[PDB]
Amino acid sequence: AITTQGKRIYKITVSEAGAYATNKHRTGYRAPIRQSNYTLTVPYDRFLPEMIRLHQSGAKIVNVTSVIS
Amino acid sequence: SRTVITEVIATADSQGRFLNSTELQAAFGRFERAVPAIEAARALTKNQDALVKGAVQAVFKKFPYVTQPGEKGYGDSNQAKCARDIGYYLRFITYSLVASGTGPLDDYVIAGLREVNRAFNLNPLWYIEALNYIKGETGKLLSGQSKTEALLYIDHAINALS
Amino acid sequence: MSRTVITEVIATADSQGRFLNSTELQAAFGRFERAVPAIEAARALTKNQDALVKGAVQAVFKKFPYVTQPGEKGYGDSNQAKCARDIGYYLRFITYSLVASGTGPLDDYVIAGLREVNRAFNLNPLWYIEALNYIKGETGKLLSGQSKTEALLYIDHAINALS
Amino acid sequence: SRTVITEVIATADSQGRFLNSTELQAAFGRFERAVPAIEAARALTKNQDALVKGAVQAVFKKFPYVTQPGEKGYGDSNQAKCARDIGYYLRFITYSLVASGTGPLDDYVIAGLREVNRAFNLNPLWYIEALNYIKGETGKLLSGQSKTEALLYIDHAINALS
Amino acid sequence: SRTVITEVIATADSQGRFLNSTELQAAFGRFERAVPAIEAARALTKNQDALVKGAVQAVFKKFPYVTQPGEKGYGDSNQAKCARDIGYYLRFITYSLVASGTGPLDDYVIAGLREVNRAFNLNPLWYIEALNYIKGETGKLLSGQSKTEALLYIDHAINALS
Amino acid sequence: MNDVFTRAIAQADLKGSFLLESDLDKLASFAKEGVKRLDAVAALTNNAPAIISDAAHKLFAEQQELIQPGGNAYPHRRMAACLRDMEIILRYVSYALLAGDASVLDDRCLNGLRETYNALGTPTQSVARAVQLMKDAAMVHLKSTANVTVGDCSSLYSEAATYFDKAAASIA
Amino acid sequence: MNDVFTRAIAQADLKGSFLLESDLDKLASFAKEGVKRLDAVAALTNNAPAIISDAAHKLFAEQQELIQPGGNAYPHRRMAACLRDMEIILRYVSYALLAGDASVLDDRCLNGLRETYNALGTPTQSVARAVQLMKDAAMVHLKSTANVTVGDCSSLYSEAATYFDKAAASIA
Amino acid sequence: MNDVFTRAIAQADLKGSFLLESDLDKLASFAKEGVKRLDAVAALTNNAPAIISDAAHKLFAEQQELIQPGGNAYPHRRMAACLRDMEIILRYVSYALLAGDASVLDDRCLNGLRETYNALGTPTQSVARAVQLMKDAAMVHLKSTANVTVGDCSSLYSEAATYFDKAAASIA
Amino acid sequence: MNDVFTRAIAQADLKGSFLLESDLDKLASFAKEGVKRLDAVAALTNNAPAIISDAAHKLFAEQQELIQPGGNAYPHRRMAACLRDMEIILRYVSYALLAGDASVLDDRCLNGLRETYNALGTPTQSVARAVQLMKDAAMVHLKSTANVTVGDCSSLYSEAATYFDKAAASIA
Amino acid sequence: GNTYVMESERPATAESQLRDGRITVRGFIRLLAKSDTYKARFFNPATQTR
Amino acid sequence: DSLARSTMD
Ligand SMILES: CCC1=C(C)/C(=C/C2=NC(=C\c3[nH]c(/C=C4/NC(=O)[C@H](C)[C@H]4CC)c(C)c3CCC(=O)O)/C(CCC(=O)O)=C2C)NC1=O
Ligand SMILES: CCC1=C(C)/C(=C/C2=NC(=C\c3[nH]c(/C=C4/NC(=O)[C@H](C)[C@H]4CC)c(C)c3CCC(=O)O)/C(CCC(=O)O)=C2C)NC1=O
Ligand SMILES: CCC1=C(C)/C(=C/C2=NC(=C\c3[nH]c(/C=C4\NC(=O)[C@H](C)[C@H]4CC)c(C)c3CCC(=O)O)/C(CCC(=O)O)=C2C)NC1=O
Ligand SMILES: CCC1=C(C)/C(=C/C2=NC(=C\c3[nH]c(/C=C4\NC(=O)[C@H](C)[C@H]4CC)c(C)c3CCC(=O)O)/C(CCC(=O)O)=C2C)NC1=O
Ligand SMILES: CCC1=C(C)/C(=C/C2=NC(=C\c3[nH]c(/C=C4\NC(=O)[C@H](C)[C@H]4CC)c(C)c3CCC(=O)O)/C(CCC(=O)O)=C2C)NC1=O
Ligand SMILES: CCC1=C(C)/C(=C/C2=NC(=C\c3[nH]c(/C=C4\NC(=O)[C@H](C)[C@H]4CC)c(C)c3CCC(=O)O)/C(CCC(=O)O)=C2C)NC1=O
Ligand SMILES: CCC1=C(C)/C(=C/C2=NC(=C\c3[nH]c(/C=C4\NC(=O)[C@H](C)[C@H]4CC)c(C)c3CCC(=O)O)/C(CCC(=O)O)=C2C)NC1=O
Ligand SMILES: CCC1=C(C)/C(=C/C2=NC(=C\c3[nH]c(/C=C4\NC(=O)[C@H](C)[C@H]4CC)c(C)c3CCC(=O)O)/C(CCC(=O)O)=C2C)NC1=O
Ligand SMILES: CCC1=C(C)/C(=C/C2=NC(=C\c3[nH]c(/C=C4\NC(=O)[C@H](C)[C@H]4CC)c(C)c3CCC(=O)O)/C(CCC(=O)O)=C2C)NC1=O
Ligand SMILES: CCC1=C(C)/C(=C/C2=NC(=C\c3[nH]c(/C=C4\NC(=O)[C@H](C)[C@H]4CC)c(C)c3CCC(=O)O)/C(CCC(=O)O)=C2C)NC1=O
Ligand SMILES: CCC1=C(C)/C(=C/C2=NC(=C\c3[nH]c(/C=C4\NC(=O)[C@H](C)[C@H]4CC)c(C)c3CCC(=O)O)/C(CCC(=O)O)=C2C)NC1=O
Ligand SMILES: CCC1=C(C)/C(=C/C2=NC(=C\c3[nH]c(/C=C4\NC(=O)[C@H](C)[C@H]4CC)c(C)c3CCC(=O)O)/C(CCC(=O)O)=C2C)NC1=O
Ligand SMILES: CCC1=C(C)/C(=C/C2=NC(=C\c3[nH]c(/C=C4\NC(=O)[C@H](C)[C@H]4CC)c(C)c3CCC(=O)O)/C(CCC(=O)O)=C2C)NC1=O
């Protein structure tokens, strides 16, 4: 985090894809329904768990942008 | 789409290590299962219309009280596309036989079941007795192991409807 | 708290709040049917343990000649007894994982926390890697049919863990 | 590369407040500790090539089996890699001395060491002995605060290696 | 409380790692800055009564109306409480100088002071004026390092008040 | 996230009919060939350390500019990420190979990795050629017939090559 | 998230040569001016609340509209956010002054603030006026040599001026 | 959590009076020798891998009941937990040495470790023996004076030995 | 997420001057008319499941293709999603009715619903036709003055009509 | 755990960013746990199992 | 104490 390699936070735009919604229905609505598209800001170190978890959830990454560098 | 290899892939990709012996052996067992299940599906598709119609008259017989004018299916069109729905469920049973897993059932029919039944005032017990007639006939048609997976899949479907 | 196919199935079913569907039954059937070659391999390895351990000792000696001279870690009669004991326990746990139809025994017994043991005892894995290499070389004739590959899978996983 | 200033300001940003006695005191003490570490970095810069060659021969000396043919360490391009790698290590040690913190070494090499080392089958003992030579030569190079800074940073790199 | 050595111990606990040269440098600088801080503690301790009385009368000078009957300042018990509070503050400032940090002061006055302020209508500006007078008074009681560090401690306290 | 069998099932659904006789024959044959591809992917998992070691050694031998100061593989963490990308990408390729459907490969990070590397500034052509190294090393390792009986593997090799080509195209 | 020594080390690493004795001399010159620079930072810090209050009072003085209906600060919450945003901006400028670098100030505070004010519609001109008043009051309190040894701080004043100017430019 | 300075301030608050000039002089003397204590704890930390290696080797040479099956440290995971247990014991002893007070060691390792090991079935006397062996290795490593100015550190040696004594008495 | 009162107070603060008597009079008149609209909303809530059932029956009547394989409502859970969407859109109509403002509908759902159903590719004209179905059935049950006093709900009927029309216009 | 947090201890910046909504409540909980007061109340006076 | 009893059976 504090490290120069820990910095360079990147923003992520996330779309709750159709496959994501189909998986969500079978798993169950334990979270409130929000509009499929939403934005998010993620540091470098926890950048990985974000798209990993989106991959098990079935969603796909719209794009990636860098806050720093 | 939860065929056994599908959750194999999901479990592998969830954490960092590759496939180890357990799921390789599970896939071996699946490929072993795939043949007798495929003759099961073939023989079942050989007997589509007779089965669906016979189950339809069975549904009438077991519930006579509904069959009165005022029946949800009363009238030729309603019972006809009732038989259509039964054929649809048989379709998805065949699909699960191909997948050797509840993928098709869970994905398509079971999802949203009770909500739709409340929405359209449909008693699942009709469907249940239809699949009971399915048990009755498939006790003869399919034999051996293929019979066993077919019976178990229909049992899972019934428990979903139950 | 071992992880075997049936125990993994039970844990998954308990986690999901549901009973056992078709896939669990098929996996149990596969494990039950594969147990027979695994038991065959376990008995065959049980018969010839002394030859395996002795050959492993001499193979480790011949591969790296720089060891058994005095003044280093491996030299010593107590060191030799520890070599024999370690190889024996390795093959013990390999047989255990063969019988369990899962790597859980090996993982929990040795692979859990092995690396800090090595770095706290200067034990580079390479000696035991060569030991298991000789072990698979010997078992290349010991078993037959399915038992051969059943042993191969778990021993290869153990080697990869050692890597 | 991390500086005591950097960690102080990162903590202040996390707590979202201004700087009190402790942060200013740490900043000061790092500024007075800056110049002896600078001098130590210069004194290690002057002997860079001699240190590199001495470390190479120390590696070839301590463990007999690194020199023979068929060994990973053996190789003309391999020896060039040895010299270049030792130069990397000690240059980033100088960087850490410059920043007056271990952070430069930490991120620049120490992060991701072990898995890369077994990725290509790299012996940590080799780099440990190279840095032992670094200790031996830098002990006679420096005296005083610069000596303490250099020895502590190289030994921190060793502890990361160990 | 939060002393430099205490927070170093805590953070070393956090990452599950031993201490390194940077935090030992921080402790070093703490040890050397202790001596001027120790002399500051001596000068403040020997002057405590005059400090308190001067601060109380300076607050009275700035806001004599508070002493008028029907207000908080009026009442010998009220004035005694003013003096006792200022004495507590001065003692905690001495503890801050001794501890080389705001730890004891923060924990023992700054934690939960504004609650009492609002409840008991105790205007912070009064203690701010008292601490400003203590600043002016220690400007002559202390000089050099001790004056500067005591000043920064007390103005930290003032900024916390406001 | 659909298997090849699930792919055929979805196709039959969209035609709104049952699966064809020829479809049944092809899928039963694929099930018969399932053991061979299981052995192939088991070797892939077992040969994975050898594959990654050989591929990385070849890459660094023929690309030293990755290792020069400031290089894309210089900081010892950028190259560490390169190694983990190697193992995870060959992991996805093995996933696709055993699956029999490239759709899961495309959906798993193939939709995001291209713009990820565009943002990071890494040249994707190096990634693609490292994927070619994956292909070479993995094919060489799988060619070994030790301790296993001999049989046809040409179709599996062709399928794996197509999967590697798809991965390279998606990356770059 | 870096300081000037980190900057120099980053270039030294990416070239991969050693930090020159000339570079060491320059950063040592910064270091021996570091003691004075920390006094400048403490002058920013301890005097921050009064500086902010005076600057905000002036903002209300020249810009009467912002408290009046239709002003960007007319709701109480909005001028409250004005106060806290100026406080955090001065805090980050002090961070820049103590670190002796622009990276520390520009990485977090000055990275998404312009987009926030653009999307929300905040008049960046008023924020720039607030920042320059922050700079003016900061100079007024930094020239105060009360209870501290007198000396020349021209480098510190110039560097803090650069930090305030660059912060205003990033906001604008 | 509390060190000597914190403990003294705590007593001062308990009596409600300022710190005594005598105790202020005691703290001044403690701070004067603080460089020696820092050297001692540095010697601890560099030799900590060596201290733990020596202690583990000698303990396993004298006790063999654990290396065999059924021993409390028989499996790799169990004995690895054992090793990190001694590691953390030494770490907390070092922390107490930094603090000069045993409050932090009590807060971390000596509030409830005993019943923890009783539930785990761990024999405490083995832990105490390991503490003694680490203490011997540590006094050996700190009584050396490598690369540091020589001086009378018998007070520090006594303090470290006594800290190990309290730790051992706590566990067993 | 506004209402009539919120928007009125908003514009009143926008002009800066106090509320004007005429606006207060309109608000009071609405308040007097309030209970009628309240009972209308309650009746809508009571009849909602029947509304959905009948409207779905109609939706199948004029469009059969969705039931047929491949329809976006052909799968069981997809048509279940269709039903709950009918639910939520008519619920938002009820929200608009009880509030009397349009932004509480617009901002809360419509903005994101646009891209939602554009990405889903569902023909929005059929969605608006279904909305018209709910409009008809809801007016059938609402015009029903069963078990309640008879009164003039014509303005409320117009408001409900406008709410259905604007919802359909937004979605289509 | 029903420990009363002094009003001075709380982080204003984190709650302000949550108020704007750029950070989820999960992120705010992360920032809370990472705050030193969490360790001082919980991690510092208590054993690691506890 | 409660966690201890779950380790064995
Ligand atoms: C859970 C079952 C189990 C395993 C797996 C096991 C391995 C093992 N071997 C050990 C020591 C040892 N092991 C060896 C064997 C070495 N001699 C060399 O030729 C080779 C590199 C290698 C064997 C071929 C030696 C020499 C030691 C002594 C290390 C020392 O004390 O310095 C130790 C440390 C315990 C002690 O010092 O008494 C372990 C844990 N022990 C077990 O109870
Ligand atoms: C912060 C204070 C503190 C520390 C450091 C601590 C260490 C600690 N040791 C544990 C178990 C253990 N502790 C040991 C150590 C034993 N091995 C040998 O045989 C000796 C008899 C003895 C060491 C000399 C072992 C082997 C276990 C594992 C128990 C088991 O799996 O059977 C556990 C619980 C389970 C686990 O972490 O795996 C902890 C938390 N406990 C605390 O409350
Ligand atoms: C995706 C899997 C699937 C299911 C679960 C399914 C059942 C189903 N039943 C429906 C209504 C109906 N369902 C039935 C049949 C029931 N009432 C009779 O009494 C029978 C005895 C009994 C059957 C056991 C009838 C008569 C209707 C007509 C009501 C209407 O048109 O709204 C509908 C509404 C649209 C339509 O099919 O015309 C569906 C989708 N169809 C499917 O494609
Ligand atoms: C700047 C960060 C950095 C580090 C830390 C580093 C170490 C390092 N050396 C490597 C190759 C190598 N390194 C060596 C040298 C080692 N064997 C012995 O001779 C020596 C004692 C020792 C070096 C001092 C050798 C022989 C190779 C050949 C590849 C192999 O077989 O592993 C590799 C793999 C790819 C490469 O760089 O060529 C790394 C990561 N390289 C870096 O770019
Ligand atoms: C953390 C404890 C600590 C503090 C607080 C600190 C500040 C500090 N700065 C000093 C010298 C100085 N301080 C300054 C800066 C000040 N003079 C200028 O007139 C400006 C108005 C102002 C800058 C805002 C200057 C110019 C010097 C003399 C230059 C030199 O360092 O030789 C001195 C020595 C004189 C004395 O004993 O008071 C101290 C203590 N140093 C510390 O170790
Ligand atoms: C779902 C699976 C997944 C993938 C595939 C993935 C790619 C990926 N690689 C990254 C960094 C990186 N990846 C590489 C590797 C590339 N550059 C080298 O030259 C090689 C030729 C090449 C190997 C393919 C490098 C060098 C970086 C560092 C970039 C930086 O420091 O900014 C990052 C940024 C965060 C990080 O991992 O450090 C991502 C997201 N992330 C994922 O979660
Ligand atoms: C759980 C994972 C798994 C294992 C452990 C496994 C072993 C295995 N594979 C088999 C089929 C086979 N295995 C191979 C081995 C291939 N021949 C080529 O040379 C390749 C180098 C090599 C790997 C691709 C062959 C040729 C067959 C027979 C092909 C067939 O009949 O389908 C058989 C039956 C052969 C017999 O009993 O006579 C076994 C026991 N199979 C699996 O799916
Ligand atoms: C819609 C939200 C809103 C509110 C609530 C509001 C009231 C308000 N009046 C203010 C100025 C002021 N308000 C007062 C009045 C107070 N001082 C005394 O005279 C009186 C006893 C007392 C009145 C009861 C004064 C004198 C100022 C000038 C402060 C200054 O000297 O700058 C300020 C602070 C700005 C400043 O410092 O000049 C606010 C927030 N304005 C708004 O836009
Ligand atoms: C990433 C680090 C960080 C930054 C950069 C930050 C500043 C920041 N400024 C914001 C907008 C704002 N900025 C201002 C201040 C302006 N408007 C008027 O008051 C003045 C003319 C002028 C100041 C001179 C206001 C009032 C808002 C919110 C507008 C509103 O809510 O209507 C916002 C979004 C809404 C909010 O304040 O909650 C943030 C987060 N906070 C952070 O945690
Ligand atoms: C980064 C942390 C740090 C270290 C490591 C450090 C070492 C260090 N130890 C010192 C003195 C000393 N250091 C020691 C301690 C050592 N001598 C004894 O023989 C023991 C074997 C051993 C401790 C167990 C002693 C006894 C002195 C002499 C006291 C004095 O010079 O005032 C000095 C002062 C040199 C001088 O005054 O000329 C330094 C810089 N300084 C630091 O800021
Ligand atoms: C947050 C507020 C909210 C909105 C804005 C909303 C609309 C909405 N409908 C959705 C899916 C859907 N919407 C429909 C309905 C359409 N397709 C046909 O049946 C009809 C012609 C037509 C309806 C009249 C269908 C079938 C899906 C499922 C698509 C799929 O599963 O692939 C989704 C995707 C997420 C999910 O299904 O849970 C949303 C967000 N629902 C909400 O809770
Ligand atoms: C438990 C919650 C609750 C409800 C829902 C409720 C309904 C309700 N609405 C009322 C006003 C009324 N509300 C209506 C509206 C109705 N007549 C027609 O127009 C429509 C079919 C329908 C509304 C859409 C009418 C006509 C009145 C009588 C107003 C009058 O006196 O002229 C009254 C008082 C009747 C009176 O004093 O004259 C009641 C009790 N009361 C409650 O305590
Ligand atoms: C569910 C409702 C509720 C109850 C029942 C409650 C009791 C309560 N009192 C507490 C501390 C305290 N409670 C008191 C109050 C008592 N001690 C004094 O002697 C007085 C005689 C007396 C008040 C008149 C004090 C002084 C403390 C401080 C002790 C401490 O936290 O260190 C705490 C610890 C909270 C924290 O600081 O994190 C709780 C939970 N708190 C609640 O939110």
H-helix or E-strand spanning residue A61: strand A60-66
- The CB of H78 under 6 Å from ligand 2? The reply is yes
Give, as one character, the DSSP assignment of residue F109.
I
Give residue G70 CA to ligand 6 midpoint distance, Å: 49
Burial readout I117-127 (b: 16 or more C-beta within 10 A, e: otherwise): beeeebebebb
Contact flag C140-F46 (C-beta cutoff 8 Å): no
Q: Give the span between the Cα atoms of H72 and H121, in whole angstroms.
A: 8
Chains in touch with K (3+ beta-carbon pairs under 8 Å) read H
- Give start and end residues of each alpha helix (H) in chain C: 5-15, 22-47, 49-63, 77-100, 104-106, 114-121, 126-142, 146-162
Q: Give the span between the Cα atoms of C56 and C53, in whole angstroms.
A: 5
Nominal resolution (angstroms): 3.1
Q: Give the span between the Cα atoms of B137 and C5, in whole angstroms.
A: 35
CB D8 within 8 A of CB D27: yes
Contact flag A26-B111 (C-beta cutoff 8 Å): yes
The residues facing A38 across adjacent strands are: A14
DSSP string of B44-113, one letter each residue: HHHTHHHHHHHHHHHHHHH-TTTTSTT-TT-SHHHHHHHHHHHHHHHHHHHHHHHHTSSHHIIIIIITTH
Give, as one character, the DSSP assignment of residue E101.
S
- The CB of J21 under 6 Å from ligand 9? The reply is no
- Give start and end residues of each alpha helix (H) in J1-50: 12-20, 25-34, 36-38
Q: Which of H32, G10, F79, E75 has its CA nearest to residue E66? A: E75
Q: Give the span between the Cα atoms of E156 and E142, in whole angstroms.
A: 18
Torsion of CA B63, B65, B67, B73, to 10 degrees: -80
Interface of H with J in 92-111 (CB under 8 A): 107-109, 111
Give, as one character, the DSSP assignment of residue J7.
T
Q: Give the span between the Cα atoms of E117 and E161, in whole angstroms.
A: 10
Q: Which two tokens stand for residue G152?
A: 């020349």
Q: Give the span between the Cα atoms of I138 and D48, in whole angstroms.
A: 87
Q: A50: distance to nearest CA of chain G, Å? A: 20
Using CA of residue G46, residue G50, residue G52, residue G55, what is the dihedral sign?
negative
The residues facing A11 across adjacent strands are: A41, A65
Q: Which two tokens stand for residue F36?
A: 């061979």
H-helix or E-strand spanning residue F7: helix F4-14
CB D158 within 8 A of CB D132: yes
Residue of B9, B35, B98 with shortest CB distance to F104: B9
The full 3-state SS of H121-156, as one line of letters, equals: CCCHHHHHHHHHHHHHHHHHHHHCCCCCCCCCCHHH
**Residue I49 forms contact with B (CB below 8 Å):** yes
Best residue for ligand 1 mutational test, from C54, C69, C86 (most atoms within 8 Å of Cβ): C86
Burial readout B86-114 (b: 16 or more C-beta within 10 A, e: otherwise): bbbbbbbbbbbbbbbbbbbbbbbbbbbbe
Residue of A22, A25, A35 with shortest CB distance to I116: A35
Best residue for ligand 7 mutational test, from B24, B31, B32, B33 (most atoms within 8 Å of Cβ): B24
Residue of B25, B32, B149 with shortest CB distance to C22: B149
CB D51 within 8 A of CB D90: yes
Torsion of CA I141, I143, I146, I149, to 10 degrees: 150
- The CB of I81 under 6 Å from ligand 11? The reply is yes
Amino acid letter at G160? A
Measured at the alpha carbon of residue H43, what is the angle toward residues H41 and H49, in degrees to the nearest 5? 105
Q: Give the span between the Cα atoms of B71 and B78, in whole angstroms.
A: 9
CB E84 within 8 A of CB E49: no
Q: Give the span between the Cα atoms of B97 and B34, in whole angstroms.
A: 8
CB I99 within 8 A of CB I5: no
Residue H100 dihedral angles phi and psi, to the nearest 5°: 75, 0
Q: Which two tokens stand for residue H123?
A: 């024999």
Q: Which two tokens stand for residue D77?
A: 């391009």
> What was the experiment behind these coordinates?
cryo-EM
Number of Cβ atoms within 10 Å of the Cβ of G99: 27
Contact flag G91-D18 (C-beta cutoff 8 Å): yes
Pairing of strands A60-66, A37-42: unpaired
Q: Give the span between the Cα atoms of H89 and D95, in whole angstroms.
A: 34
**Residue D42 forms contact with C (CB below 8 Å):** no
- The CB of H49 under 6 Å from ligand 1? The reply is no
Q: Which two tokens stand for residue F25?
A: 């024959």
The residue in chain C having the minimum alpha-carbon distance to the alpha carbon of residue H52 is C120
Amino acid letter at H14? L
The full 3-state SS of chain D, as one line of letters, equals: CCCHHHHHHHHHHHHCCCCCHHHHHHHHHHHHCHHHHHHHHHHHHHCHHHHHHHHHHHHHHHCHHHCCCCCCCCCHHHHHHHHHHHHHHHHHHHHHHHHCCCHHHHHHHHCCHHHHHHHCCCCHHHHHHHHHHHHHHHHHHCCCHHHHHHHHHHHHHHHHHC
Contact flag F148-C153 (C-beta cutoff 8 Å): no
How far is the first Cα of chain K from the last one, in angstroms, to the nearest whole number? 14
Pairing of strands A10-15, A60-66: antiparallel
H-helix or E-strand spanning residue G157: helix G154-171
Q: Give the span between the Cα atoms of C72 and C77, in whole angstroms.
A: 13
Give, as one character, the DSSP assignment of residue G16.
T
User: Which residues neighbour E30 within 8 Å (Cβ) at sequence distance 6 or greater?
Assistant: D25, D29, E4, E5, E100
Q: Which two tokens stand for residue G4?
A: 């000037």
H-helix or E-strand spanning residue F80: helix F78-99
Q: Give the span between the Cα atoms of E92 and E88, in whole angstroms.
A: 6
Residue of C108, C111, C117 with shortest CB distance to H79: C117
CB A63 within 8 A of CB A3: no
Q: Give the span between the Cα atoms of B156 and B106, in whole angstroms.
A: 10
Q: Give the span between the Cα atoms of G114 and E61, in whole angstroms.
A: 48
- Give start and end residues of each alpha helix (H) in H16-153: 21-32, 34-62, 76-99, 103-108, 113-120, 124-143
Contact flag H107-J48 (C-beta cutoff 8 Å): no
Q: How many CB pairs under 8 A join E and H?
A: 93
- The CB of C60 under 6 Å from ligand 1? The reply is yes
Residue A11 dihedral angles phi and psi, to the nearest 5°: -80, 145
Using CA of residue D29, residue D32, residue D34, residue D40, what is the dihedral sign?
negative
Contact flag C21-B102 (C-beta cutoff 8 Å): yes
CB G10 within 8 A of CB D98: no
G/C touch flag: 3 or more CB pairs below 8 Å: no
Give, as one character, the DSSP assignment of residue A37.
E
